[PDB]
């Protein structure tokens, strides 16, 4: 950071003040500034045509707002609060895009079932009234001191009511509303989320939106007021004057820097016209929340922080918003290596959560235990959500392991009859200074798999420096794929014959032929499982919900394969290999 401090100093052309030291230590942290990934992110094919990240057109009438976020570091320190607060943060993120958060999909990676993590997510999810539609849960001792908590949230928003994630013109104002601001953010880095407040924050924000009051928005998370306001105006090439004496407080004797940087939970930034502001506060008050007009959007691209008439801070806004950028490494993929089988156990999400009185996937077209969460929006309209990763492969080869994870997310989406629309991604990695090439290999694999598949990146998250005594975690890119599907066309499991369709090993040049085979068979109403292990206990237990028994002879499969299980009355006719292996009956 001494390097960064020297950059800051050159840019300001003087010693930074106490407040600038605090402000930049947040904004230029890897968590906020993305110094090691920004360049890699610029090389990702992204969803242009969408005027905000995370929001993807579905049928011209509805979009889906979705994003995945990590909460690894808090969760290692306090599993329960870390996980619960993780859920609360990603809900606010989706909300800010203008969507009623309506679906949660968890991606958990741990040495063990950490009760506090499963319970923190369950309890919070139960209290906010937002359903868990699925979970990917992987168990490996390689994760013992660094559990990964990735949470994906989604919701539907009218195309005629999208919320911008920027300020738009000088003279707009910014309202901060929701929970009051305390001294929040080792145990000092843990915050206590409360779902009851966030539940009121959802209703109040959606009410504001409906009235036409929200002209832009951003959730408060890391960095608090500073992050939200600097970024709103930085994205619109504007400035802000922030009046800290106006933030509603929970502890009155806070110093201005403490108000600026507090990471108190359940807060929202709303950009509006100054004449709409008293109605916004009217609504927040009605919903038992705290609110005030806090910043003025200005034309000069300066970030000026006030406490009453006291200048707290003034810097160029684009200095805060653009952390120093670390050079990329050019990564060159060699041949696909042979993979070993590495011990990663899968846990049934529905089984694990059921113990904390928490349902998974109840309002879905088909159970997510079969591989993808399918949601009904209208009679002939819906979407799908898939969360997938292959850290067991990325361990051995980071590029190919990562690329396959993406390709397999496509298989899963096609398997329910859905067409891939977009990816949200969570990069979970160790130390990029120690190991630059691993990060490079991940980012390039994401870049090339998006290219190979035609599926763009909509949103994402990077969590770096996941280590214990310098031992890095397995490089884990969590892929969350959005797909489009007619729920009327989704196959349910039926008494049928089972076939292994494809090849027991992997060659990139035949993946698209498998996809074409899945598509064809899906169009004809076949039920299709696509899983690394081919068939799992989760599959078996899910079939029992339908009163069905599987008796199969599974083909021997490599750690990376190009096979799926197709359930149909008669033999699949496809330009891919087909072997009859058993039955599904009763």
Q: Which residues from 23-82 bind Cl ion, rule CB under 5 A?
A: 24, 28
Question: Would you say 554 is a known binding-site residue?
Answer: no
Question: Contact at 8 Å (CB) between 30 and 38?
Answer: no
Q: Is 145 a catalytic residue?
A: no
Closest distance to Cl ion from the beta carbon of 16 (Å): 8
412 is in an annotated binding site: yes
70 annotated as belonging to a binding site for a ligand: yes
Structure tokens at 211: 């009235």
The set of residues, in sequence order, having a beta carbon less than 8 Å from that of 531 and lying 6+ positions away, is 371, 539, 565
Closer by beta carbon to Cl ion, 28 or else 307: 28
Q: Name the catalytic one among 36, 71, 109, 243.
A: 71
Task: Choose between 11 and 199: whose C-beta lies nearer to Cl ion.
Answer: 11
Structure-token match 């993120």, residue found: 93
Could you tell me the smallest distance in angstroms from the CB atom of residue 11 to Cl ion? 11
Q: Kindly tell me which of 465 and 503 has the beta carbon lying closer to Cl ion.
A: 465
Asked whether residue 57 is marked as a ligand-binding residue, the answer is no
**Which stretches does DSSP call E strand in 434-577?**
457-463, 467-468, 471-472, 476-485, 496-503, 527-529, 549-552, 562-568
Based on CB atoms, which residue is closest to Cl ion, 24 or 353? 24
Distances (CA, A) of 304 to 21, 167, 219, 253: 15, 16, 21, 22
CA distance readout (Å), 494 to 329, 404, 536, 565:
50, 30, 18, 14
First to last CA, the chain: 64
75 annotated ligand binder: no
- What's the Cα-to-Cα distance from 485 to each of 56, 414, 452, 523, 530, rounded to whole Å? 14, 9, 22, 11, 17
Smallest distance from Cl ion to CB 183, Å: 22
Query: Taking the CB of residue 445, how many other CB atoms lie within 10 A of it?
Result: 26
Q: Is 519 annotated as a binding residue?
A: no
Question: In this structure, are strands 267-272 and 173-178 parallel, antiparallel, or unpaired?
Answer: antiparallel
Minimum CB distance to Cl ion, residue 467 (Å): 21
Which 2-21 residues touch Cl ion, going by CB under 5 A? 4-5
Shortest Å, Cβ 261 to Cl ion: 13
If the CB atoms of residues 3 and 43 are measured against Cl ion, the closer one turns out to be 3
Name the CA radius of gyration of the chain, rounded.
24
Number of residues that bind Cl ion (CB under 5 A): 4
Element (H, E) at 520: helix 508-523
What is the DSSP-derived secondary structure letter of residue 114? -
Residue 586 marked in a binding site: no
Residue nearest to Cl ion (CB): 24
31 is catalytic: yes
Site for Cl ion, rule CB under 5 A: 4-5, 24, 28
Which residues are known binding-site members for ATP?
Answer: 34, 67, 106, 135-138, 371, 412, 425, 460, 532, 539
Which residues are known binding-site members?
Answer: 34, 67, 69-73, 92-93, 106, 135-138, 191, 219, 263-265, 371, 412, 425, 460-461, 463, 532, 539
Which residues are known binding-site members for Mg(2+)?
Answer: 69, 93, 219, 461
Known catalytic residues are 31, 71
């Amino acid at each position: 950071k001494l390097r960064y401090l020297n950059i800051l100093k050159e840019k300001l052309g003087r010693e930074p003040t106490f407040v600038e030291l605090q402000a930049f230590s947040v904004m230029w942290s890897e968590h906020c500034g993305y110094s090691h990934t920004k360049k890699y992110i610029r090389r990702l094919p992204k969803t242009g045509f969408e005027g905000n990240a995370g929001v993807v057109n579905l049928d011209d009438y509805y979009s889906v707002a979705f994003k995945i976020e990590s909460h690894n570091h808090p969760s290692a320190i306090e599993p329960y609060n870390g996980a619960a607060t993780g859920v609360g943060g990603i809900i606010r993120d989706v909300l800010a895009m203008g969507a009623r958060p309506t679906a949660i999909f968890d991606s958990l990676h741990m040495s063990r079932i950490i009760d506090g993590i499963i319970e923190g997510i369950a309890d919070y999810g139960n209290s906010i009234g937002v359903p868990t539609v699925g979970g990917e849960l992987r168990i490996s001792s390689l994760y013992a001191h660094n559990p990964l908590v990735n949470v994906l949230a989604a919701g539907v928003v009218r195309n005629d009511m999208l919320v911008d994630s920027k300020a738009s013109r000088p003279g707009q104002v910014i309202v901060i509303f929701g929970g009051a601001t305390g001294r929040d953010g080792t145990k000092l880095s843990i915050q206590v989320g409360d779902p009851f407040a966030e539940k009121m924050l959802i209703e109040a924000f959606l009410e504001m939106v409906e009235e036409g009051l929200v002209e832009g928005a951003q959730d408060l998370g890391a960095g608090g007021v500073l992050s939200a306001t600097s970024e709103l105006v930085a994205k619109g090439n504007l400035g802000a004057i922030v009046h800290l004496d106006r933030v509603p407080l929970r502890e009155p004797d806070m110093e201005p820097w403490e108000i600026l940087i507090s990471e108190s939970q359940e807060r929202m930034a709303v950009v509006t016209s100054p004449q709409k502001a008293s109605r916004i506060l009217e609504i927040a008050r009605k919903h038992l929340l705290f609110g005030d007009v806090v910043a003025e959007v200005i034309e000069e691209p300066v970030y000026r922080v006030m406490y009453r008439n006291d200048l707290v801070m003034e810097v160029p806004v684009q200095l805060l918003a653009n952390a120093p950028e670390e050079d990329i490494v050019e990564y060159t993929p060699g041949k696909i290596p042979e993979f070993k089988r590495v011990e990663f156990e899968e846990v049934n999400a529905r089984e694990v959560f059921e113990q904390y009185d928490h349902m998974v996937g109840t309002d879905t077209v088909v159970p997510p235990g079969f591989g993808a969460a399918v949601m009904r929006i209208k009679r002939d309209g819906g979407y799908s959500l898939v969360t997938h990763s292959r850290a067991d492969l990325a361990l051995q080869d980071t590029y190919w392991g990562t690329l396959i994870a993406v390709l397999e997310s496509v298989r899963k989406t096609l398997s329910v009859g859905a067409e891939p629309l977009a990816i949200t991604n969570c990069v979970n990695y160790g130390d990029p200074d120690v190991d630059p090439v691993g990060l490079s290999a991940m980012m390039t694999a994401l870049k090339n798999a998006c290219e190979f598949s035609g599926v763009p990146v909509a949103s994402g998250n990077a969590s770096l420096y996941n280590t214990y005594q310098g031992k890095p975690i397995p490089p884990t890119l969590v892929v969350g794929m959005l797909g489009k599907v007619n729920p009327q066309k989704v196959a349910k499991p039926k008494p049928s014959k089972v076939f292994a369709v494809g090849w027991n090993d992997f060659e990139l040049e035949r993946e698209k032929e498998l996809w074409r085979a899945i598509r064809k068979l899906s169009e004809e109403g076949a039920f299709i499982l696509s899983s690394s292990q081919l068939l799992t206990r989760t599959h078996v237990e899910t079939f029992r919900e339908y009163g069905l028994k599987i008796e199969v002879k599974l083909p021997e499969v490599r750690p990376a394969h190009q096979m799926v299980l197709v359930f149909s009355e008669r033999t699949p006719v496809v330009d891919v290999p087909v072997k009859e292996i058993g039955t599904l009956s009763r």
